DNA sequence: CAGTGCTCGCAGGTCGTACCTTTTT
DNA sequence: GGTACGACCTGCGAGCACTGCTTTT
């Protein structure tokens, strides 16, 4: 043990990793060693001040940094597994899974997925006066999710500034959110946002529970605090409130989540909320060559009313930062394609390189261009593996197995394994659930009996589901799924129309393969199948080698690569058609995004643009990004083969 | 040298049974020993004249007479096994199964039922000028079957006397028969009447075949010759023509089949057709008590223009013949029910008794009144066991398995084990067979390929694939287990199992079909029997196989009864409108006289007691109607004794 | 370009109609 | 009375037309 702070950390990084008690703010620029300090402190609390691992909580946004830090502390300090380290939402689960029965969340409270929460909205919209038969359900969800991100009730939504939200009348939307709650609450179901707001509701209402939890978080670490919303803050303040051992780390230049409700004021107001906090500032960049740093510092400079802090380079100015405008986007794909294999020959490993884009659609062209040259590719945050119809419906059987209520799942799974269950019979069964205010699954069992709703076809279904329930009380997750896949008939469907479907059944076996890992894994000892549906539904962009890493500019936050390709630096993408109509605040949100990208590169940064670009079936002229003007003369533009132009 | 004639037969019976070569007619009244002569000649040909059994043929109308003459043979004479004994239609089968190719019947031609005849008709009658729904199919079937009973061709039908037939224009009906032939023919298929006409057609065109068959029929016997139709006669004359050893037996008073197309002239004109024949006449009734005979003799007496022949009773006048008019038809069922039990305790066994009725609907009432009292009931000629959907649909798989072109069977099967097979796709499949002149089966295999009958393209390939599996299982497999295969693999058991509460008694019948298919191949005459051989045997069955699928009262029609006898016989529904029937009355005297022969046959079945009944009211299919005594009881009045529900005169 | 919705045409089940009653291979 | 056949809904599937690319636990 005995990790001298001064050995692996510079003097102020050391003094901050030495902070023991009280509120602390660690505020510094990109690649200044913020996270690394956060990892060394965790080791320094245990080894020096003798804090027990079980007293420590460290929370970030994406689960990629969460695992990073777990192991990261380990080869210094054992007990990475004794530490509580995850996202706010993962914590939200664990807390509400242990304490849910206090607030009216019973056994079988579900995790209603994003796509899942649409069928709910569609089913409320008919009842509501605010209309467009044209208003997209996902617009209503935008309102709701963001509202719980601000920690507002439907009543607080009646009183919001704007008389119209998105496309809607203030009171209409509020009412949707008011009938959304009643429906989902009556299904014993909670959504993403609830995992935060409901926890905040748990600590305010039952103070004795908070007290017991704060024993597990005595010493509280938060990375990426610049991206925390009002809810997350409120949860944080409540967890700190007893011992006030809260130490948050962040950068304001890096706050890219505003669209989802990120509050830049949370990191910038930290000492107004905690006057007694200590403030540590890091001025040095350890990550990048001075060549890509000067480029970053000159870009972010253009942002106005930002805290101006020193970021001084510690590395010699490296290989010049380059940009290439290729006539086509396909030639942009081939430029990156080509220049990956070149850099490879020179000795760069595939994994040390990564491709960053504004929006996901940009990845399709990139892939095939890699595929062509046969460059191993690893895409992060594409169309999910758990998004695919194959896997999704199986879990809908899995959810409905544990939760007789879910009618959002019943919709997807009643149809595909064709039981010939009627369309008009689905409406009367919804009129059965409408008249009885009832758990829908039992009405189908009672279809032959009672009010008699094609009669028996329902009794045979409740029997197939009871068979899943009895197989849900006892049987193993890996083989319980198989039971479902088989006995539902989904596997007989897929076999019967199987030529394209055979690759679909291949996915379905892989679900058993991933469920083997989950079960035979170390943290899952005696893990329930309900615990698996939990862990699947919260996954960020390991469950979701030596390959080029494709992904979005947003996802990248917190990582670093020796070589980084930023593609689609163009007016309309970087700063986006949305962010252009926003006005200065919009452009300045983007400028931070482009900043985060630039600060990812360690040795080389290669950025590209296209003269023409296609989006869904029309080719359009493309203009260089306004941001390249901001950095002009800090980079050398390049021809498809690599020389200045 | 064994079977001494003068011991078991009276002298003229003996002289007749002694006839060896040349045409011979034995013509006598009821219960005279005509059939009883027929063995003793057959036995006398073998033991005395040294005729070889394989040279002998004996023919009748009903398998019941095929049983009679087989038992009569075996239980009375050694070496009875090779004797060729069956009906005309059964003969037609065996002859056409052996020689068919000479006349253009391919290997494995299919034998259609009478029900079967209607998918063919319903297919053709849309194209012909005489329009349907006014004219239902079963009328057109009536013409064709009767046309071929006369041995006539569509052209001959254009030349019939009547300008209208049943409800139809002469040439319209003729045209339907002309397009029914071309259809049936193109399926490699033939109906019953063909089993005669085609055989007659086979002997006329190819002489060398007739010659080879006439070796097996050198000596020919025909019982019940009075009921033979024009075709049957023509088939007989041809089989006789070479050696002319034909001996026919019969009674004119007994000719009840005119509606069938029976020729009363055939037995009457025998010596005009065979001027060298011998004519033996039996004047004695061995069967019945003098009391049941006098009643018969005095009834038939009323018929006019019939040959007058003395039937003199040999048995003392027995228990008086009784008649009872019960208020209801139910009380008539109850009177029969009641009096059966009575006759039982006094020592009569159930089987010695039988109940005869005119039309089959009369049996339902009777049954339950037997069931009530719990009297064992053996019903002959009711709704067939092989008529039932369960059975019939399985054999439609069997037929179609052997014969790809059977679109009459395909209809009754393709949809039953629901395959998603198109209603509207059946019309496209029929427009495929209409456009291609093809058998239907290969259009289903060619579904995914070719013209692609879609919205279910795969559905048809999976069908023809289920049928090839039935073809290969038809290739080499046991009849018993081959049907099981069909029952399972078609999914017909699956349907009845799934909705199985009522369908369990149905899947029980399907067990019985495997049971009789098991009982059949175990049978002695079936050695190395093909399943094609079974379907042949099944579709020709008269009113053993039908009755099986003991010691019981026998229920059956007056018609079927022809040729049998019982010590006790009930005759029910002797009433104006049943005996002689509402049709027979409208026919006028010829009709009246037919029915009088029909009633005559009933009376002459009874050995010891005949008991006849009537109802004052009779329900048929809803409304209860006033019922009247039959005008025939008038004919026999003072001859019998009326009775009350308990047995004494009113 | 693609994923989703939404409407046409076709399978099968259930429910109300007409005719039945001659008789058999 | 019984059956056998012809007209009425529900049910599912495969070519339209359509419509959306921000960014995420
Ligand atoms: N005292 C040090 N000596 C050498 N390297 C260091 C030191 N401190 C930090 N680093 C390195 O600096 C790099 C980035 O550190 P990091 O913790 O990721 O900063 P960060 O602020 O969390 N990055 P970001 O979240 O994007 O702003 C890592 O490669 C560290 O190894
Ligand atoms: N010579 C006889 N000796 C003893 N019994 C006889 C003699 N002749 C006839 N019988 C019996 O009387 C029955 C009637 O004769 P049978 O020929 O069988 O009926 P049938 O003459 O054909 N009447 P039917 O069948 O209505 O035309 C026979 O079956 C014998 O039982
Ligand atoms: Mg960091
Ligand atoms: Mg006889």
Numbering used by the authors:
A (entry chain B): 5 to 457, 460 to 547, 550 to 552, 562 to 662
B (entry chain A): 5 to 547, 550 to 555, 562 to 662
Please give sentences taken from the publication describing this entry:
UvrD is classified as a SF1A helicase and plays important functions in DNA replication, recombinational repair, methyl-directed mismatch repair and nucleotide excision repair. UvrD consists of two RecA-like domains (1A and 2A) that are responsible for nucleotide binding and hydrolysis and two additional domains (1B and 2B) that are involved in dsDNA binding. Here we present crystal structures of full-length and a C-terminally truncated construct of D. radiodurans UvrD (drUvrD) in complex with 3′-tailed dsDNA. Our structures obtained in apo- and AMPPNP bound states provide us with several snapshots of this essential cellular process and reveal a large-scale spiral movement of UvrD around the duplexed DNA.
A ternary complex containing 2 molecules of intact drUvrDFL, a 21-mer DNA duplex with 7nt ssDNA extensions at each of its 3′-ends and the non-hydrolysable ATP analogue, AMPPNP, was crystallized in space group P21 with four drUvrD chains and two DNA duplexes per asymmetric unit. These crystals diffracted X-rays to 4.0 Å. Despite being present in the crystallized protein, residues 663-745 corresponding to the variable C-terminal region could not be traced in the electron density map, confirming that this region is particularly flexible. In the structures of drUvrDFL and drUvrD∆C form I, each protein monomer contains one bound AMPPNP molecule, whereas in drUvrD∆C form II each assembly is composed of a DNA duplex with an AMPPNP-bound UvrD on one end and an apo-UvrD on the other. In both drUvrDFL and drUvrD∆C form I, the two drUvrD protomers are located on the same side of the DNA duplex and induce a bend in the DNA. In the case of drUvrDFL, one of the two assemblies in the asymmetric unit forms a very bent assembly (25° bend in the DNA axis) where domains 2B of the two protomers come closer together. The second protein-DNA assembly obtained in drUvrDFL crystals is more similar to the assembly obtained in drUvrD∆C form I. In these structures, the two drUvrD protomers are still located on the same side of the DNA duplex, but the DNA duplex is less bent (16° bend in the DNA axis). In drUvrD∆C form I and drUvrDFL, the nucleotides at the junction between the dsDNA and the ssDNA are poorly defined, indicating that this region is relatively flexible. As in previous crystallographic studies of SF1 helicases, our crystal structures reveal no direct protein-protein contacts between neighboring UvrD monomers, even in the crystal structure of the intact drUvrDFL, in which the duplexed DNA is significantly bent, bringing the two UvrD monomers close to each other.
